[PDB]
Coordinates of C-alpha atoms in Angstrom, one line a residue:
Chain A
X6 CA 89.8 93.1 91.6
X7 CA 89.1 93.4 95.3
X8 CA 92.7 91.4 95.6
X9 CA 94.4 94.1 94.1
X10 CA 92.6 96.7 96.4
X11 CA 93.9 94.7 99.3
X12 CA 97.3 94.3 97.6
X13 CA 97.6 98.2 97.4
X14 CA 96.3 98.5 100.9
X15 CA 98.7 96.3 102.5
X16 CA 101.8 97.5 100.3
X17 CA 100.9 101.1 102.0
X18 CA 100.9 99.8 105.4
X19 CA 103.9 97.9 105.0
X20 CA 106.2 100.9 103.4
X21 CA 105.2 102.9 106.4
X22 CA 106.5 100.5 108.6
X23 CA 109.2 99.4 107.0
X24 CA 110.8 102.0 104.6
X25 CA 109.3 105.3 105.4
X26 CA 112.0 108.2 106.8
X27 CA 109.4 108.7 109.2
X28 CA 108.6 105.0 109.9
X29 CA 108.9 105.4 113.8
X30 CA 106.2 108.1 113.7
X31 CA 104.1 105.5 111.6
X32 CA 104.9 102.6 113.8
Chain B
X7 CA 99.0 101.8 84.3
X8 CA 98.3 98.2 86.0
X9 CA 96.7 98.8 89.4
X10 CA 99.2 96.3 90.9
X11 CA 101.8 98.6 90.0
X12 CA 101.7 100.4 93.5
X13 CA 103.3 103.1 94.6
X14 CA 103.2 104.5 91.3
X15 CA 105.0 108.0 90.5
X16 CA 103.3 110.9 88.6
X17 CA 105.2 112.2 85.5
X18 CA 106.9 114.7 87.3
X19 CA 108.3 112.4 90.1
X20 CA 108.8 110.0 87.4
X21 CA 111.4 112.4 85.6
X22 CA 113.0 113.2 88.7
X23 CA 113.4 109.3 89.6
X24 CA 114.6 108.6 85.9
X25 CA 117.1 111.7 86.3
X26 CA 118.3 109.9 89.5
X27 CA 118.4 106.8 87.6
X28 CA 120.5 108.3 84.8
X29 CA 123.0 109.7 87.3
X30 CA 123.3 106.5 88.7
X31 CA 123.9 104.7 85.5
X32 CA 126.7 107.4 84.8
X33 CA 128.2 106.8 88.2
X34 CA 128.1 103.0 87.6
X35 CA 125.8 102.6 90.4
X36 CA 122.9 100.9 88.6
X37 CA 122.1 97.4 88.1
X38 CA 119.3 96.5 85.2
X39 CA 116.9 93.8 85.1
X40 CA 114.4 92.4 87.8
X41 CA 116.8 89.2 88.7
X42 CA 119.7 91.8 88.9
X43 CA 117.7 93.7 91.2
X44 CA 116.8 91.0 93.4
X45 CA 120.4 89.8 93.7
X46 CA 121.4 93.6 94.9
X47 CA 118.8 93.5 97.7
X48 CA 120.1 89.9 99.1
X49 CA 123.7 91.5 98.9
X50 CA 122.3 94.5 101.3
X51 CA 123.4 96.9 98.6
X52 CA 120.7 98.3 96.9
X53 CA 119.6 102.0 97.9
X54 CA 116.3 102.2 95.7
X55 CA 114.6 99.6 93.4
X56 CA 112.7 101.1 90.6
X57 CA 110.0 99.1 88.6
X58 CA 107.9 99.6 85.5
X59 CA 104.1 99.6 85.9
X60 CA 103.4 98.6 82.1
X61 CA 105.5 95.2 82.8
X62 CA 103.3 92.2 81.4
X63 CA 102.5 90.2 83.0
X64 CA 103.4 92.4 86.2
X65 CA 103.1 89.4 88.6
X66 CA 106.9 88.6 87.7
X67 CA 108.1 91.7 89.7
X68 CA 105.8 91.1 92.7
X69 CA 108.2 89.5 95.2
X70 CA 110.1 92.8 95.0
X71 CA 108.0 94.9 97.2
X72 CA 107.9 92.1 99.7
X73 CA 111.7 92.0 99.2
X74 CA 112.1 95.4 99.6
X75 CA 110.0 95.4 102.7
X76 CA 112.0 92.7 104.1
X77 CA 115.5 94.8 103.6
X78 CA 113.9 98.3 104.3
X79 CA 114.7 99.5 100.9
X80 CA 112.5 101.9 99.2
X81 CA 110.7 101.2 95.8
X82 CA 108.5 102.8 93.4
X83 CA 106.9 102.0 89.8
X84 CA 107.3 104.6 87.0
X85 CA 104.7 104.4 84.3
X86 CA 107.0 103.1 81.5
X87 CA 109.6 100.3 80.8
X88 CA 110.4 102.1 77.5
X89 CA 111.3 105.5 79.6
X90 CA 113.0 103.4 82.3
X91 CA 115.3 101.6 79.9
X92 CA 116.4 105.1 78.2
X93 CA 117.2 106.5 82.0
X94 CA 119.3 103.2 82.6
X95 CA 121.2 103.8 79.4
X96 CA 119.9 101.1 77.3
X97 CA 118.0 101.0 74.0
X98 CA 115.6 98.3 75.1
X99 CA 112.6 98.1 77.7
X100 CA 114.1 97.9 81.6
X101 CA 111.3 96.4 83.8
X102 CA 113.0 96.5 87.1
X103 CA 116.4 98.5 88.2
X104 CA 118.2 98.7 91.3
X105 CA 120.5 101.7 92.5
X106 CA 123.4 100.6 94.6
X107 CA 125.3 102.3 97.3
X108 CA 128.4 104.7 97.0
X109 CA 129.3 106.4 100.0
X110 CA 130.8 109.4 98.2
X111 CA 128.2 110.1 95.7
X112 CA 125.0 112.4 95.9
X113 CA 122.8 109.7 95.0
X114 CA 121.9 108.5 98.4
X115 CA 120.8 112.2 99.6
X116 CA 118.5 112.5 96.5
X117 CA 117.0 109.3 97.1
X118 CA 116.1 110.5 100.7
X119 CA 114.1 113.2 98.9
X120 CA 112.4 110.7 96.5
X121 CA 111.3 108.8 99.5
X122 CA 109.6 111.7 101.2
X123 CA 107.8 112.4 98.0
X124 CA 106.7 108.9 97.8
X125 CA 105.5 108.8 101.2
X126 CA 103.5 112.0 100.4
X127 CA 101.9 110.0 97.6
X128 CA 100.6 107.6 100.3

């Protein structure tokens, strides 16, 4: 379970940094 | 919905996404299947990867978010593999699909809006 919470958190960070239309602002 | 199926679209964003998927099917800008989707990513031709939150076991999809991050391609989960396969134009479940590029269509512009909505979920 804590595994899945961390997975979600890391997926969020990487979507903001690597994929987002506004990724520069998130970087 | 499986909690590893993240980010996950609501029923409204889901209908929007599935509508874009169905447009893509009609335009022949769509690949169905997890491995078919992987292959589009490695060719550099995916615009958007859509996966099903009710895929069991969901682990078999989990390389895809990581690949999409590596390739800077947006992805999302919708709740239902049955509905995703209907959108794709087949009568069977679809656990992953990939919209591919076409410079003369409106798909990229719709995907841009969808990304903004997904980012608002985060």
